[PDB]
Amino acid sequence: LRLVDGVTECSGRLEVRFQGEWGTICDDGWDSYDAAVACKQLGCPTAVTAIGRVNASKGFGHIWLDSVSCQGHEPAIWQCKHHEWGKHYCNHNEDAGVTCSDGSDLELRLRGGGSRCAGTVEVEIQRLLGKVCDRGWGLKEADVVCRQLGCGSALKTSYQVYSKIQATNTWLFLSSCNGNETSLWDCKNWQWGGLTCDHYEEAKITCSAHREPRLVGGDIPCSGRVEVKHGDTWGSICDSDFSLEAASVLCRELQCGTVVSILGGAHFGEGNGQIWAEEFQCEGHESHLSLCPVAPRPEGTCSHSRDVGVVCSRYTEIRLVNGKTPCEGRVELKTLGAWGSLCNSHWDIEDAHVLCQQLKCGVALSTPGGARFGKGNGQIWRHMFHCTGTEQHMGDCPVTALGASLCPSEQVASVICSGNQSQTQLRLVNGGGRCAGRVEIYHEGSWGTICDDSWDLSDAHVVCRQLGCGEAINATGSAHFGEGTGPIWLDEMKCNGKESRIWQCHSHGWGQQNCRHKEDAGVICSEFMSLRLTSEASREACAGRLEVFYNGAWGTVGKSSMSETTVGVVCRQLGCADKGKINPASLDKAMSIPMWVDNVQCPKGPDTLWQCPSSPWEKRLASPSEETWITCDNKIRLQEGPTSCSGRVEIWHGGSWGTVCDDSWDLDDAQVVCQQLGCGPALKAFKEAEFGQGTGPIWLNEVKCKGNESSLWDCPARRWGHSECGHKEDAAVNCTD
Amino acid sequence: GQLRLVNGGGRCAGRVEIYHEGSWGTICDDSWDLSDAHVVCRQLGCGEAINATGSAHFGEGTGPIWLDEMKCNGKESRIWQCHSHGWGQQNCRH
Ligand SMILES: *[C@@H]1O[C@H](CO)[C@@H](O[C@@H]2O[C@H](CO)[C@@H](O[C@@H]3O[C@H](CO)[C@@H](O)[C@H](O)[C@@H]3O)[C@H](O)[C@H]2NC(C)=O)[C@H](O)[C@H]1NC(C)=O
Ligand SMILES: *[C@@H]1O[C@H](CO)[C@@H](O[C@@H]2O[C@H](CO)[C@@H](O)[C@H](O)[C@H]2NC(C)=O)[C@H](O)[C@H]1NC(C)=O
Ligand SMILES: *[C@@H]1O[C@H](CO)[C@@H](O[C@@H]2O[C@H](CO)[C@@H](O)[C@H](O)[C@H]2NC(C)=O)[C@H](O)[C@H]1NC(C)=O
Ligand SMILES: *[C@@H]1O[C@H](CO)[C@@H](O)[C@H](O)[C@H]1NC(C)=O
Ligand SMILES: [Ca+2]
Ligand SMILES: [Ca+2]
Ligand SMILES: [Ca+2]
Ligand SMILES: [Ca+2]
Ligand SMILES: [Ca+2]
Ligand SMILES: [Ca+2]
Ligand SMILES: [Ca+2]
Ligand SMILES: [Ca+2]
């Protein structure tokens, strides 16, 4: 037995001698055990044994064996089962070969991509280059390939072409891999060399640690400065290189839910280290940042005073603390920087389901009451979740803490859930809230409405009782909240008002109706909430007296201990700006509406005032000096300019600051901007980001101000909320001081 | 290795297109100045450049964008001889 025409003395085409002459062996039936016995027979290492002839040429003469089967026990090849000598039909393009190695000389890399863990799969076996064949290439094999290199799960069979890759002749053919072994070399029956990859492409792969994201520096679970890892090294991101879609993808990968806001500057503290120069181009629907396209720049980057930060929805920090097992005990959550136990008063089983689905262990069995699992360490939090049971995290549930009633002495929430992780209706729509809108009922695997015939407050009481919304204030019909689509399930509802569920009423029966969709029913319940700033000029202005809607009536909110964060939440909820200032009461005209709530303290997470803890609702008559008046900061600002009111234009919307593209930017729009800021006539309207690149998303494009509008949103704009623009074309203005 | 002008009403005016990687593509207008236009005109034998235009003055193109950030010094013989971010390295739109 001999090996010829190979890289070393331990690899090459295999030859056998008979009658005095050497001859070749056919590769059919030649498996890894045959190569193992061939390596063992010769004086060569046998730790790793592979099939195939490496860079060897075609055979010559007779083929003296075919379709052997050694099974690995027989010391020598000819002791195995084999066919008739010389009498076989293989041509000289099918000659066998063997590749024996110690196992410390085999190494595979990824080349052509943006990091260690994205590219074409290049293989180094005994200092000979190669590639892996597309034939049979799938994510299940890519998983072991990127497990051996030290990266995460494979995600795609492609990559971005960062650099060109040289050509190679050999090829590596891979059989099916079980998907759990810790190296590609451990896959069964992999061939090195021999066969050609005709009608097939090279193996490509992209895996998780290509662009792995992270959030650092925040005081709440799902907010902070954004950092990304390019395989091995971490780096911050410029606020001008990150978009709203990229933020959505980032917070989807990290399990933080939907994006609440992008924050520029260095909101969460300046970082240290590398700043990347890649502009993301996510379409929004990706699952990992690694899958997004990116545009690198060879030039320099921003300063560290422009690191992007993100705030996302899942800001609730909830846990089970005291109990026999880590998946049962008292429930605690931290807000306003302090831990506290929840209130049982409006805590039910559907909430426990999401509590222990968040913690990834089973489903809830019961909700023990009282001090059975421990008393609170101090003050009790009065938050009331309204989970529907189908969401995987508490931050996805509707929450309310504004005006919640004070709890009794020792009613504290607790939960017990099973360990088996494998364990796995009315809705109000179009009402501007959760406890108001058109009523839809889910009975036969589809959502349907209810007729307004015989529809009165008596049935609306049942509707607002089953959903967790208190009592009924309005029982509307005639499709007040818009026409529905789907079945009309119920008619002639005759609830007595004390029922607990809607179907317990003496209706005519499912599908027994004579209605159209213009007769869909709706409700407005007592727990409906709305916020308003009132002034004489307009009832929905951006500066005036603050009012809240509750129990069907409008009232005012006291100014006691009103912090900056609370006014920020108010302004952001109303859509005015990111922050505002309290004022002494105006003197134009004050209606005598009562006051609803006071002592409102908002944490840093929520973007609605309904989630801020406060004292319980209490209607009182109080002096106008105790009223809350707010002026929200301007919705448009000019930044980085040499004076107060010249520079780059930025606009607040959707919880984030952004910029205006310059595709149709002109002096007529600069007039509007300067007038809005209260500055003299416009002089120049710039283009192509004269005063530097912007922050956040591009909120506007092709604005069409006529030159006399009172604000930019009075102007027409064919684009609003989405733009085919980059940050390199931000608009700026120069006005008279 | 071919350079072409399209939609300009003549062979010595219009949108610039480069044939590479088996397809026609465009050049971004970022830093597109009179010197790069001079190089194009010299390559096509059309003399000295008079206008260098951007913002798709001759109409939005189709196909990939091949070169951004052209920094020709004005004396180059062929356009691809200039400094640039490389084939396909772009952050532009049509
Ligand atoms: C397929 O691959 C093997 C592995 O490289 C090839 O074997 C190598 O062939 C080259 C010729 O290109 C030999 O180079 C020569 O080496 C001697 C050393 O004394 C020197 O005198 C010559 O000037 C020349 O450099 C090389 O020795 C040989 N072996 C190794 C270990 O590199 C093989 O030829 C390829 N083809 C086939 C059909 O197997
Ligand atoms: C909800 O019901 C209230 C009354 O409980 C309605 O308020 C009245 O609205 C009418 C106009 O339709 C006014 O003339 C009255 O002054 C309002 N108050 C009272 C006490 O009658 C309210 O309009 C209803 N809302 C909806 C959406 O149906
Ligand atoms: C090509 O450049 C010339 C300048 O060399 C431009 O001609 C000027 O255009 C402006 C704007 O309409 C006029 O005010 C000037 O009077 C024109 N002449 C000169 C000598 O400045 C010409 O418009 C440019 N063409 C294009 C298509 O961009
Ligand atoms: C704005 O315009 C005034 C008046 O022309 C000029 O003095 C000033 O330098 C301009 N500012 C900038 C930043 O160009
Ligand atoms: Ca009716
Ligand atoms: Ca009724
Ligand atoms: Ca009816
Ligand atoms: Ca532009
Ligand atoms: Ca305009
Ligand atoms: Ca440009
Ligand atoms: Ca240039
Ligand atoms: Ca560019």
From Swiss-Prot, chain A:
Induction: Induced by anti-inflammatory mediators such as glucocorticoids, interleukin-6/IL6 and interleukin-10/IL10; suppressed by pro-inflammatory mediators like bacterial lipopolysaccharides (LPS), IFNG/IFN-gamma and TNF. Expressed in monocytes and mature macrophages such as Kupffer cells in the liver, red pulp macrophages in the spleen, cortical macrophages in the thymus, resident bone marrow macrophages and meningeal macrophages of the central nervous system. Expressed also in blood. Isoform 1 is the lowest abundant in the blood. Isoform 2 is the lowest abundant in the liver and the spleen. Isoform 3 is the predominant isoform detected in the blood. The record marks V4, D5, V16, R17, V68, S69, D95, A96 as: Cleavage. It is a single-pass type I membrane protein. Glycans are attached at N474, N734. GO terms for molecular function: scaffold protein binding; scavenger receptor activity. One of its GO terms (biological process) is acute-phase response. Residues 1-101, 108-208, 213-313, 318-418, 426-526, 531-633, 636-736 form the SRCR domain. The SRCR domain 3 mediates calcium-sensitive interaction with hemoglobin/haptoglobin complexes. Interacts with CSNK2B. Intravenous lipopolysaccharide (LPS) produces a rapid rise of sCD163 in plasma of patient as it induces metalloproteinase-mediated shedding from monocytes surface. Long-term LPS infusion finally increases expression of the membrane-bound form on circulating monocytes. Acute phase-regulated receptor involved in clearance and endocytosis of hemoglobin/haptoglobin complexes by macrophages and may thereby protect tissues from free hemoglobin-mediated oxidative damage. May play a role in the uptake and recycling of iron, via endocytosis of hemoglobin/haptoglobin and subsequent breakdown of heme. Binds hemoglobin/haptoglobin complexes in a calcium-dependent and pH-dependent manner. Exhibits a higher affinity for complexes of hemoglobin and multimeric haptoglobin of HP*1F phenotype than for complexes of hemoglobin and dimeric haptoglobin of HP*1S phenotype. This is Scavenger receptor cysteine-rich type 1 protein M130. The chain holds residues 266 to 1030 of 1156 of the full protein.
UniProtKB/Swiss-Prot annotation, chain B:
Induction: Induced by anti-inflammatory mediators such as glucocorticoids, interleukin-6/IL6 and interleukin-10/IL10; suppressed by pro-inflammatory mediators like bacterial lipopolysaccharides (LPS), IFNG/IFN-gamma and TNF. Glycans are attached at N51. Expressed in monocytes and mature macrophages such as Kupffer cells in the liver, red pulp macrophages in the spleen, cortical macrophages in the thymus, resident bone marrow macrophages and meningeal macrophages of the central nervous system. Expressed also in blood. Isoform 1 is the lowest abundant in the blood. Isoform 2 is the lowest abundant in the liver and the spleen. Isoform 3 is the predominant isoform detected in the blood. A soluble form (sCD163) is produced by proteolytic shedding which can be induced by lipopolysaccharide, phorbol ester and Fc region of immunoglobulin gamma. This cleavage is dependent on protein kinase C and tyrosine kinases and can be blocked by protease inhibitors. The shedding is inhibited by the tissue inhibitor of metalloproteinase TIMP3, and thus probably induced by membrane-bound metalloproteinases ADAMs. Residues 3-94 form the SRCR domain. It is found in: Cell membrane. Disulfide bonds join C28-C92, C72-C82. It comes from the Eukaryota. Interacts with CSNK2B. Acute phase-regulated receptor involved in clearance and endocytosis of hemoglobin/haptoglobin complexes by macrophages and may thereby protect tissues from free hemoglobin-mediated oxidative damage. May play a role in the uptake and recycling of iron, via endocytosis of hemoglobin/haptoglobin and subsequent breakdown of heme. Binds hemoglobin/haptoglobin complexes in a calcium-dependent and pH-dependent manner. Exhibits a higher affinity for complexes of hemoglobin and multimeric haptoglobin of HP*1F phenotype than for complexes of hemoglobin and dimeric haptoglobin of HP*1S phenotype. The SRCR domain 3 mediates calcium-sensitive interaction with hemoglobin/haptoglobin complexes. Intravenous lipopolysaccharide (LPS) produces a rapid rise of sCD163 in plasma of patient as it induces metalloproteinase-mediated shedding from monocytes surface. Long-term LPS infusion finally increases expression of the membrane-bound form on circulating monocytes. This is Scavenger receptor cysteine-rich type 1 protein M130. It comes from Homo sapiens (Human). The gene is CD163. The chain holds residues 717 to 810 of 1156 of the full protein.
